[model samples]
Target: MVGQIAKEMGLRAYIVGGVVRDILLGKEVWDVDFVVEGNAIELAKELARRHGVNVHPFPEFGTAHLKIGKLKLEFATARRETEPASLKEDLIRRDFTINAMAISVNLEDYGTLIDYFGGLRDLKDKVIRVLHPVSFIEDPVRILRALRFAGRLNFKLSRSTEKLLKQAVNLGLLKEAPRGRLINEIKLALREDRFLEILELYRKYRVLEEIIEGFQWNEKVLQKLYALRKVVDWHALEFSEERIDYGWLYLLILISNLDYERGKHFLEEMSAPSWVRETYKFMKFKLGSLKEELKKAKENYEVYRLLKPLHTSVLLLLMLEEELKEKIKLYLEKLRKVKLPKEKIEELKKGKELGERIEELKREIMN
Candidate 1:
């Protein structure tokens, strides 16, 4: 990429970010990022024409995507940025050791590495340190990112970084960083490290609390959520099976502390759906009823009615946190022995009826 682009280019260019770090570490990485000194469109057009590739330009960002048959490349202008007009400023302003690196890709320094903020050695020691001490003061979400980085790479945040985190939370920059970015970053980081240890990191760092704000972190919710990765079988579960998601399961457990109506109100604030609203409420009701049964010495038949329609996750939540003892075990045993209907496993020769197949599965599972 450096050779072809430099030979046909309208400006100077530099290979940057993660690509440079990985290459220097002797890691096998195919993804590359480049920054150019002039018009990215001009360079992209020339490179595409010369290399027999396609160029897709985004005039808004002065960026373009290049495709040489199967290989894909991203190209953007190397311009300095400030707060309002600066992704560079927003990205680099905080100065974190994990990502404050850049590199060159022109003829004179093809593989040369740049460490503007000591990210190279930090990368070696598997350390996540801030480029500046005032970072957390600058933006509180970096506290979350620091934890995310530690969990992601199985590293530790340096002492200053940890202190900065507490400072950030205190200063209220936790409210300053963009909430949308924080949400997606947290989701992706957890998805990558579905490890019990990672959720523990979220709790220890209070990253989850900072982002979601009202999470009731107690002994029960804490331990169960921390153990989430052990039970999250993402491979077997479809994306739509959010009933098993740690977020939902944890919420179900949290809402158990509140009365039904109050719990539903909290869920509504969390943007929960009607079915999910009912599901969490049902879980609360069942657990509370179980408590009542023990208190009054009620019959098991009365308990059975309340548990019949509960899903696997709901039952798991009940059993794991000690809700309905015998009923939970029996339901779990039934789940273990049951099978998805064979009639639902069809992969068609061609015509697309995606929703229809899902509807077919619902009917099959019912009767």
Candidate 2:
């Protein structure tokens, strides 16, 4: 049906960007981005009409998304911007080399690949190079996206791309861009195995200041960052469903060099969520207690109670890979053994708190 729709448009449709790139690398495919010469929203609307669903269009960007069953067909037109806007031209503005390539969806050019920016060579070299030198200046978020794509694909930035990222930081242009979006990119970047090294690269790029104002890089934080990097699985994470109320910034703030008061303030400044504030509060309070719990002679139920309400932030897990394991390990050891005294279990049937119920069982290990 997509193929038929592409044919009806009389324009070439390419199954481009990440889809083509991932397939070439033999990696598991995620969402596929498509490019067409004509209107994307109408195409989306038309496509959705066929499927008896809906099309949501953001006419401002000339982009739209098509909903069809479990699959969301995201549609974008391959547009060439005029003058200063050229820096953000779609195909030319992709964050990295590999993402710049496209392949045809029209039956005639089906399986035929498009490489307008020498993306093939860059991918072969395992490098993430910006399409245009001025891309970061035009869209500062691209600087973070470059780091993210580089980390995820195990690719290094083309030296020129790195320099552009650093220059954007030096000029503090990212401040003009959305801080929330930039941090979100950082979260996406950390969902890879080598996130720690990439995080050090974040510090190296001097993006820390433009991002969260004053997150000083240090040993404990770096170690935690590195640990989280090694453990994340980007493929397993879901967009609509979140494991933790915490998302990108909350995790970043948790590992930040700020205290509770400062951390909460930082989140508020970014227009961050109240969930972030609450999660930060809980994580700080509970994580500290969990660490202390591991050092003490606490029972399993006590330990579980300390950490139970808490949810793990995959974003934080992506960035702080190393210490993240130990952080969870202590919790897990106690979590797995959690059990109320046998008598207390019986009391729950009667909806009782049952403090007296455990009296007979209390003597066995009365600490």
Candidate 3:
């Protein structure tokens, strides 16, 4: 479908990178990437015209986005690769061997796999291999991506790749790179079930210190993070499974104990997203007051009243406090489940009146 469209626009498109690799692994793939020998923005416009969808184009990076229903596709023009674009040379400049392959989308050679590197064989062997020795130095974000792929796909890093990963850390490439890029990878790791294991790898290589200055990877930190996962699952037993945003909660735990000003500075330096900074600010201002409120809870409604305005991060963080664990569980079990009776909610408008009804229900449910 995409091939024919690009062909009509006087362009050549190639299905590239992870989309091809994932197809070979027989995993369900939805995010597709296309590399074009012509203007990707132009191709994206053509797509938007045909489908009545929208195209978001980035002129500087030669990339564009189009979403059809739930399927997301990225289009990028071939790189400067310096001077002019060549698909084979562009593949050589990629991050890893297993992701450096492409399949031509032209009708004459549809589905023909192009592996300038040994991407196919490495994929079959379950290995993570960098395309070139300077791959990490040129761009250090690949370090996090390599680890992500390893944990995500249950693959092993090639010995050479591991050796160079350490070198990149030592050379200060990762430490010196923009924090926005590094934080994104941290976000990815925290969202996965294997985050604790990924942290172990970070410690093994001293990568955490490179990213977060003065950070240590001790056994207790490991247990605490893993325990946060348990606490999240524990809360989901009866209430909404996603009562707390998992990524936000994980991030809160990550920067938990620093002094308010210091914590703000650290996260700011990392160029964390606005919501992350917002959560940090909330914890700085409200965590202590809420913790105090948990102690004098005379009624279930009182606990709900205290926690209702706060993010689940407060609840998740309190799970690590030994004395507060039982109190937190009580709030989640008894109060977090309280809801306005359906008819009452239906009768209320969606603004202040609805909120007023909720508070009224909080007291009614507990009484």
Candidate 4:
């Protein structure tokens, strides 16, 4: 259907980017990105209308997204800032050589592969080589992405690419970009299968010190983070659908050993969400009290009463001891589910004592 739309519009469409890369690797594909020789917005709308789904067009960028079942189709015109005149020219601007190839979507030429920058060769060699030395300069986010791809795919960075990456980092190109953008890329790194490996890559590139200022992912911190990954997975299995935010969790753990002021400053510099900042602040303030309470906690209800107010954030920082394990399990399985009395809550609200009263009721329920 996409090819048909492009054909009617007298434009060539190619299945470009990661979809092409992952398909060749025999991996399950995620979002399928497409490129068209004509206006992508126009092509996207026509395709969406024919398929009976809405097309979200970004006319300013000549791009659009279409929702078709579970797959989201990303469409971008063949040209960007430099206004490339051909598909080959557009392919030249891709971040990495391995992702620069494309496949024809037009039925007449469908399945024909296009490789202009030795992308096929790089893929075969299992190396991450940039399209050009200045790729990271143009978009520093690609610096992080280079690490992400290397870690996730277990590929080696070509020496030239690594050298360019280090030079770009030294110039603080990423620091000049939006803080939120860097944060999002960090979130992506945390979500990857090889998050630890990605962190190692960041360390190798001196990314942590430059981004977070003097922070280091040294030995002890690495062990703690690796242990935390086990806890992260254990948590999901321990309490199903707990609404865990692994990115924030990762960030919280990353700065766990830092002093309060520096940790708070680092969070802000990374453009972390307000809730994460607040949670971190609260976590820092209450961690000492939490640990002391957990040590004294004698029953499921006692443990629940102690940690209930802070929720799982407190528990995440707690060391897993044999004695506390049963109590933690019981609190998660039973005591945490014990609801505060609604009428009692309203009654307290009438006197403007809701917060205090809710705590009282939760304690009552736990006991």
Candidate 5:
């Protein structure tokens, strides 16, 4: 449909960026981006109109976004090198070689892969290489991105790119980068399935300590992070239907090792979301008492009562505790799902007596 629209509009279009990289990697592609030599918003609007969906155009960036079912599409006007823009210029401005290639979607040359920068070579070599030598120096956030791509694709940085990255880090380039972008990259890294590997790269490259003040990565912290990973995987396998904030949970573990005041300061500086800030405060001041209560919880009802008010993120964090694992699992897998019959619940009065009786009956049934 996109190619047909581009053909009708007489504008050159190509699939660009990460989608191209993933397509070559044989990964399932859900998000796609396109760069057009002419007006992209017009093309996007035409496509969205045909699909009966609203096109979200950003005039400032000369870009538009629209979604159809699970596929997310982004369209952008190619950057101009002269009077007429060139696709090579747009590809040059991309972060890495692997993401710098494009696939021609024009009618005459459909499916012709354009690789002006040897993106396919790097893809085959399984290495992440920057388009320019000073790539990380231009945008220090690329340091995190380099590690993220490396961890995510199980790829490594080319020797020169790794040296350039370390040089940028040694010069403290990240401190000059915007906090919002840095935190955004961190959040995305934390959400990856190989988040631990990503963080390990961060630790190896000293990016973790640079981003978070006084943050230390030692064998002890490594053990806890591994434990958190195990717990997260268990939850995913046992309750695949339940959606949990694994990113926030992982960040919680990372920051939990820092001094309370320093952690709070770091989170404030990052402008973390309210739930993240609130959860950090709870973990620092309240989780100890909650853990104590759980340690003493003997009945299924008691476990449920103690855990009922906590969010799934916190529960997943609590699952890291050795003594509390079984009870937390029981509460999550069974007790939380146990409830009185709806007919019995409807028969009771709508007051404190009814609430108390429901709890009593639930407890009796568990016993």
Candidate 6:
């Protein structure tokens, strides 16, 4: 549809960026990015008009976004080198060769891949190469991005790219990079299925300590993270209905090595989400007592009472506790759903009477 529209408008359009890279890799592509040599906003507006969808245009950036069902589509004008923008110019400005390729979306040249860089060659070699020497210096987040792609695709950085990356890291370029951009990349890395491998790459490149102040990666921390991964996997399988932010949970486990004050300070500096801060506070001040109580908790109702108020993400964190795993699992699997009749609860007033009665009924039901 986009190609047909572009042809009608006599404008050149191409599917660019990760979509093009993933297509060559035979991976499932979700988001599609289209770069147009002419006016992209006009192309997007035409497409949106045809489909009855709204086009979100950023005139300053020469880009537009629109959604059709599950598909997220982004249209951008080919970046300028001189008078008029060229596709090659846009491709050259990208971070890495693997992500620099584009596929023609024009009707005549439909399906033709345009690789000005040796992106296809690098893709085949399983190597990540930057477009230029200063790519990492140009955008420090690209260093993290390189590691992310490497981890995701099991690819290695090209020798020159690795050298440049190391130089950027040594020079502390990330400190000068936008904190929001850096944090966004970190969040994306944490959400990856191969986040452990990605973190290993971060450690290998000494990017972790550089980006995160006072963060130390050790064998003990690795073991805990691995254990947390298992817990996250188990929760996903067992409680598929319940969703949790495993990324933030993993972040919590990673930062657990820091003392309470430092951890709090780090989270604050990063502008972490309220849930993350709240969970951290709970971990520092409340989790110790909760753990002690869980150890002493004998009845199912007692276990339920203790774990019920906590979020699923926090509960998953507690699953890392070897001594408390069984009780936590028991509560998650069975005890959480144990409840009294609604009518019986309505028979009592709205305060202590109702609360005490519900607790009594839960205890009775569990017993």
User: TM-score winner among the candidates?
Assistant: 6
TM-scores of all predicted structures: 0.66, 0.73, 0.77, 0.81, 0.87, 0.89
Clashes of each: 1, 9, 0, 0, 0, 0
TM-score quality measure for candidate 1: 0.66
Regarding TM-score, does 1 or 5 come out ahead? 5
lDDT of each: 0.60, 0.64, 0.77, 0.78, 0.86, 0.84
Residue clash pairs of candidate 5: none
Over the stretch 1-367, how does candidate 1's per-residue lDDT look in tens digits? Answer: 5656665653567666666666666776556666776676777777787787777888888888887755567877765552122324333653466576766667776667766667878898888888778777766656766776676578888888778776677666776788666655555554553434556777675655555535546786656654433344431253234444455565565456656666666565555646567667666556567545544534443344455556556555555544354555543444224345454454521344775665454444433
Please identify model 4 stretches exceeding 4 Å from their true place: 25-30, 80-84, 237-240, 265-275, 320-367
1-367: candidate 6 lDDT, tens digit per residue: 8888887888899999999888987877668999898899999988998999988989998899999888899999998441677889888889889899999978887778898989999999998999889788778899999999899999999889999999999999988999889888887887788888898898798787877778888888788888988998888897878865677777887787678877887787677788889888898778889888888988777777787778776787788899888878877777667444677666755468777876776778787
lDDT of 2: 0.64
**By summed lDDT, which 10 consecutive residues of candidate 3 come out lowest?**
332-341
Q: Is candidate 3 or candidate 6 better by lDDT?
A: 6
Which regions of candidate 6 fall more than 4 Å away from where they truly are?
Answer: 26-30, 50-53, 80-82, 269-271, 337-351
lDDT, candidate 5, 96-157, per-residue tens: 99999999988889989999999899999898999889688888999999899999999989
Error of 2 at 19 (Å): 2.9
Candidates 3 and 6, the one with greater TM-score = 6
Q: Which lDDT tens digits does candidate 2 get at residues 1-367? A: 6678878876556776788888898875546677777676777788888888877888887778875656667888777662222212556756677887877778876777778788899988998888778888888888777776766677888788878878888898988987678766765664554555556667777676667645666677655543443434431253324343333532564355577676777666555556555556656666455555544635644544444555545224323434434545545433344357666576554624465454333434333
Residue pairs that clash (backbone atoms under 3 angstroms), model 1? 95-131
Q: Runs in model 2 with CA error above 4 Å?
A: 28-30, 57-60, 82-90, 190-194, 226-256, 269-279, 282-353, 359-367
Best first by TM-score, ranked: 6, 5, 4, 3, 2, 1
Better of 2 and 6 by lDDT: 6
